Design a protein around this ligand. Structure first.
Ligand SMILES: Cc1cc2nc3c(=O)[nH]c(=O)nc-3n(C[C@H](O)[C@H](O)[C@H](O)COP(=O)(O)O)c2cc1C
Ligand SMILES: Cc1cc2nc3c(=O)[nH]c(=O)nc-3n(C[C@H](O)[C@H](O)[C@H](O)COP(=O)(O)O)c2cc1C
Ligand SMILES: Cc1cc2nc3c(=O)[nH]c(=O)nc-3n(C[C@H](O)[C@H](O)[C@H](O)COP(=O)(O)O)c2cc1C
Ligand SMILES: Cc1cc2nc3c(=O)[nH]c(=O)nc-3n(C[C@H](O)[C@H](O)[C@H](O)COP(=O)(O)O)c2cc1C
Ligand SMILES: CCCCCC[C@H](O)C(=O)O
Ligand SMILES: CCCCCC[C@H](O)C(=O)O
Ligand SMILES: CCCCCC[C@H](O)C(=O)O
Ligand SMILES: CCCCCC[C@H](O)C(=O)O
Lengths: 353, 353, 353, 353
């Protein structure tokens, strides 16, 4: 009796150990962030356009100039192998089966190569920078394995204060590890090489990464480059000014800064100012949420917890199911508001409440 | 201890099987739509005009130029025979006894003819278009049986995602059927005739019906024609531009698109722009709700669930009772705000909150 | 452990029979009116003026040109003898002991004369008009007994739909009666005289009373005349235009029209437009409520349920106690905001929220 | 499992006697004041500035021209010895260990001298004026003992109506006393000297203290002088006009006037109008609360209940812990919004909701 994302959340809570479930569902501090992420969608209602022929609908759209089955993506999330065996691959395959991209996390349980070898869909790589030299290693590693897009996540200068993990003394499941860091040499006692082991033993990343460093990364990567974690039209504009091909408005699903605004709050403005692809995530659970954002100008929406619920509850097939429902949900929504072609969405179909 | 519509809802929930009750009370998805439909009335409070002579009040009004006992109507609802034996007729008779119109649903359990034969009140016919040729059949059928008004419902291009029915695996009660489709030939193996049986086995309607198709219908029907399911002043204006004699602002009682705006949100504007009769429904339970809408310019309010509660709880007499209370409620309200003649209502008696 | 009005409400609910308690506490329909009456005070917060000498405070003020101990009044309420033995007199005496006026209801359990004989404080008479000739009888009766002010209540054209009384089949306690109507002749079979007995058997009043009738009353009464039940600056202005010496903004404590605006919503405007005394009631329970209204321009606040709780809980002494707390409450409030003289209150001490 | 201020509140409620806990946690009347104090922070969300180097952060700041480890202070609170043995000293020591000031209350359980002798951190003295001559005594007493700043609290002209203490018949713990008043002579039968004993037996202070009296105090004290308890930009401006070196916007933690606005409501304005140091308190529990205020222009935030929870729960170490968490909290917050130097905060990082 699995008819929406919520049903999968309930089912996942019943199958996951509290510690893992809390890792997944948890937010920062009081968790007003995740609640706000959901609430913000209620500030917009639909004003359907009647008597429009909607017998032939199309959810097909172009993201960064490349066509995909629908304006969605399974976003980068760490420790998927803790939610389900080989979670990273189960997701990549459901994404590929659905015709949409999958973004591998820097902190995945499967390596940039193992996935690229066991999957042929559109693969994106999300990069976290702990050590500058190590970052370049993964970047080229992903470049050689055929990853089409690179995504720099910037909202984790320091770790977010997530108390559920604190009360649970959460620990990365033993049978799992951060594969992308495995084999990163050692024994090399030079200094430089030592100044890397210190960062590898630090769950703390380079809080130093600035715009200048973005240029370094821009030159290093030849394909589409997106900056994730932006919460202002000003910052998205700067990113485009610095070479980015697009940005991802996001507050990390309310896991980093509890009082962070919802990316929906600066979406229309970012779209107007950048004049470039503005993707988004954080709070999306319903097809109506996704449509309101697409209607506001977003190029595509990335899914975080939504698809993870399908994974944690029923593995790969569970992810296929969540994507199938969401597509049908999105489809049904366009039909109701009278916008047969997903690419014709505009603020015209919305009403601010 | 039945003093308002709510009391009848409670009583109906106690008499109806959960499955049927959920079919009736249910809304789309999270059901924020039905809650919003109710909440929206709280955005307006009354500013009574004191020391006005209200010893002689009149609820009599003209709808589409024809006078009726009060600005109300029992709106078109499907499967009434599932709420109570011969529900369609029980309703038509309470409406006729109250001096207001009754709108027969395309998906009624009694046929366009049986009703027209067993009832002599003002009968309206709500049309759903599954098959163009079949639609014309009912249209003429209703025209010949003496139905005064035709109502094209446009907010069901595709079926609304109603999860209560999904969790219940709801099925149209065996002893009941969609009478208006009964006898629609068969055996005719021509192609055209086959391209109809496919639509008759589809709970899916012509998502193709556009403005051009509205013209076809406008020429086909010689009497008052109304378009139901509009949620924008722009669409109501277009309908009038295309021949409609009036429109029905409505979001289908929150059963089609959960995040749909309440028709109350575009009522004043639709009235100002169309300059034609603007009727409305969705959320009305109190006489105060009805009065606020009438005060905003609505020509009349159609009742959906309100009267269905009286029917499901106590059949025909139950409907008489709900109408009697609502009339008294409306009457008492005009007296309190100092507007003795229901036709003198204006935005003047309201205060936006 | 009786430190505020609420404590007395709780105590009264424990001593009163549910039927009587519901008669007292009840509101119209859903009772969103009484809740709104309370909520509306939260739209204003205090902006205290520091370093002001408040060692010598004065709550003394002039109402309609006559000085009283504080800007309060025990308002007219029907059936006080049902809340406590000789409730009307218990109240009049607490009011007189507190140095503020008491308004006798047309529907009191003690007569206009018995009170005027057993009490020497400032007595006001609230008039309800069932029969024009009978009204004049009480008016002169009160004039001869020495009542200083007359109050015409206009918000009861018809009776408010109060469902608590309906579910309880509420009936006026046997041992009690509407004394002011006792002895109003009979046996007189003339027609005119018969056209009075019909009104005396009707819990329904003259819904016909209009502005013209207000003139008749204005000429009939030589002293201060106030019109109670107004909810618009326009109506208060008209009343002054017609001779009234002041008005009482009120929605009858949410007992007549559930969706009625709170008189607080039109207080500032009524004060600005009338340029005459604007009194008010409906929802007042805290000294802060009273002060916000006085700060907005109100000349005085009338108490309804607040003092009735003291009466129902502990009779006369209970009323003395509620008044004592409210005075101390008001006093403490002026001290906190830095307005030592109650007559210096202005919108300056408020902040709209 | 003590990760935030709230955890300490819970722990303190478990260790404190209800009577003492209620004294601490209680507010005035309905306690909408303390709730509002918390709610008001939700009117602002963060708009982080990405790709900023935050690897080297600084919480160091100047308060009244003097540098301290962070923009915080343990504010003046009465009866600390009732929450924990020698609470005043436990607090002063945690403040001094944290590198921030401590403000001794006029009504402390340890004297102005005992503390100045047992502690060497930055000590401030909060003054309450019961008797003008007695006030001067403490003022000079604090001046000679080396207190750097004097703070005149003005929001206690009369005592706030706190019902928790009323229902509990709260009484100052026997083993404790108001040390700063101990030894204030007696036996002196002159008149003047008698006109002091009357004030010493009065939990009531000089409601007479006005601006003129502020001048007297301004001349008397040679160092930094701050006025606490202001709730308007106008009053803060007057204070500066009268000699104050800065002000403390505050509503006494919702303990004096329940409907008092939150100082956050007039913070930006007070900063713009005074052009002088504007400190603040009332409602602060999270680092995000503190940062929003600092971002709005506040020079520093004083802690009331937050640190008292650490004290009541675990004494001195408990206070060290609350301060340690709050510093880390503040630190983590600057990192997330991209403002490495606490002194660079501006309204730029905020979004009004
Ligand atoms: C368990 C979990 C792990 C995450 N790991 C990463 C990560 O490794 N890299 C990254 O850029 N974002 C990470 N995110 C953030 C997501 O990419 C995405 O922004 C967020 O989940 C969107 O919100 P939603 O979950 O409400 O859809 C994570 C989120 C969750 C819930
Ligand atoms: C059980 C049920 C069946 C319905 N069937 C129909 C139908 O056959 N045709 C149509 O035009 N609208 C249909 N509607 C919508 C109603 O005509 C009306 O717009 C709606 O009920 C108004 O909202 P309310 O129920 O809050 O009054 C139906 C509504 C309900 C609750
Ligand atoms: C039990 C009860 C009886 C009342 N009877 C009368 C009446 O006889 N005449 C009148 O003018 N108003 C009458 N009122 C209205 C009050 O005068 C007053 O407007 C109202 O109580 C104000 O609201 P509050 O109760 O919240 O203070 C009555 C109110 C209550 C609660
Ligand atoms: C138990 C308690 C005692 C207090 N005593 C004093 C005092 O002696 N002098 C003073 O100026 N303020 C006093 N205050 C007010 C505080 O200095 C401060 O303004 C307030 O606690 C700020 O709110 P918060 O508790 O939410 O942080 C007291 C507050 C509490 C909770
Ligand atoms: C708060 C520390 C987070 C460390 C890994 C980043 C990932 O985005 C996650 O939210 O779990
Ligand atoms: C969602 C499918 C609805 C099929 C019949 C239309 C009717 O309006 C109803 O809401 O039940
Ligand atoms: C609703 C009928 C009211 C009849 C008496 C008036 C009085 O104000 C009351 O509210 O009880
Ligand atoms: C309400 C009486 C307060 C007397 C001492 C002042 C102190 O600020 C406190 O709030 O306890």
């Amino acid at each position: 009796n699995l008819f929406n994302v919520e049903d999968y959340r309930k089912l996942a809570q019943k199958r996951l150990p509290k510690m893992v479930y809390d890792y997944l569902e948890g937010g920062a501090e009081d968790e007003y962030g995740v609640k706000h992420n959901r609430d913000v969608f209620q500030q917009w209602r639909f004003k359907p356009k009647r008597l429009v022929d909607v017998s032939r609908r199309s959810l097909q759209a172009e993201v960064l100039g490349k066509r995909q089955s629908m304006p969605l993506l399974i976003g980068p999330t760490a420790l998927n192998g803790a939610l389900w065996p080989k979670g990273d691959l189960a997701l990549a395959r459901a994404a590929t089966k659905a015709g949409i991209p999958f973004v591998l996390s820097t902190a995945s349980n499967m390596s940039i190569e193992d996935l690229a070898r066991q999957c042929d869909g559109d693969l994106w790589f999300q990069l976290y920078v702990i050590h500058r030299e190590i970052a370049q290693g993964m970047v080229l590693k992903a470049l050689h394995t055929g990853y089409t897009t690179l995504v720099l996540t910037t909202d984790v200068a320091v770790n977010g204060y997530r108390e559920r993990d604190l009360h649970n003394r959460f620990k990365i499941p033993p049978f799992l590890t951060l594969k992308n860091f495995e084999g990163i040499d050692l024994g090399k006692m030079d200094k430089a090489n030592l100044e890397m082991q210190a960062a590898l033993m630090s769950r703390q990343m380079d809080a130093s990464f600035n715009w200048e460093a973005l240029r370094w990364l821009r030159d290093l990567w030849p394909h589409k480059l997106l900056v994730k974690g932006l919460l202002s039209a000003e910052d998205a504009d700067r990113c485009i000014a610095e070479g980015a091909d697009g940005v991802i408005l996001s507050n990390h699903g309310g896991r980093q800064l509890d009082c962070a605004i919802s990316p929906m709050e600066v979406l229309a403005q970012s779209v107007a100012k950048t004049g470039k692809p503005v993707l988004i995530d954080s709070g999306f659970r319903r097809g109506s949420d996704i449509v309101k954002a697409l209607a506001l100008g977003a190029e595509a929406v990335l899914l975080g917890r939504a698809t993870l619920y399908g994974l944690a509850a029923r593995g790969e097939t569970g992810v296929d199911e969540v994507l199938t429902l969401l597509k049908a949900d999105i489809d049904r929504t366009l039909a109701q508001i009278g916008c047969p072609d997903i690419t014709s969405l505009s603020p015209d179909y919305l009403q601010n409440e």
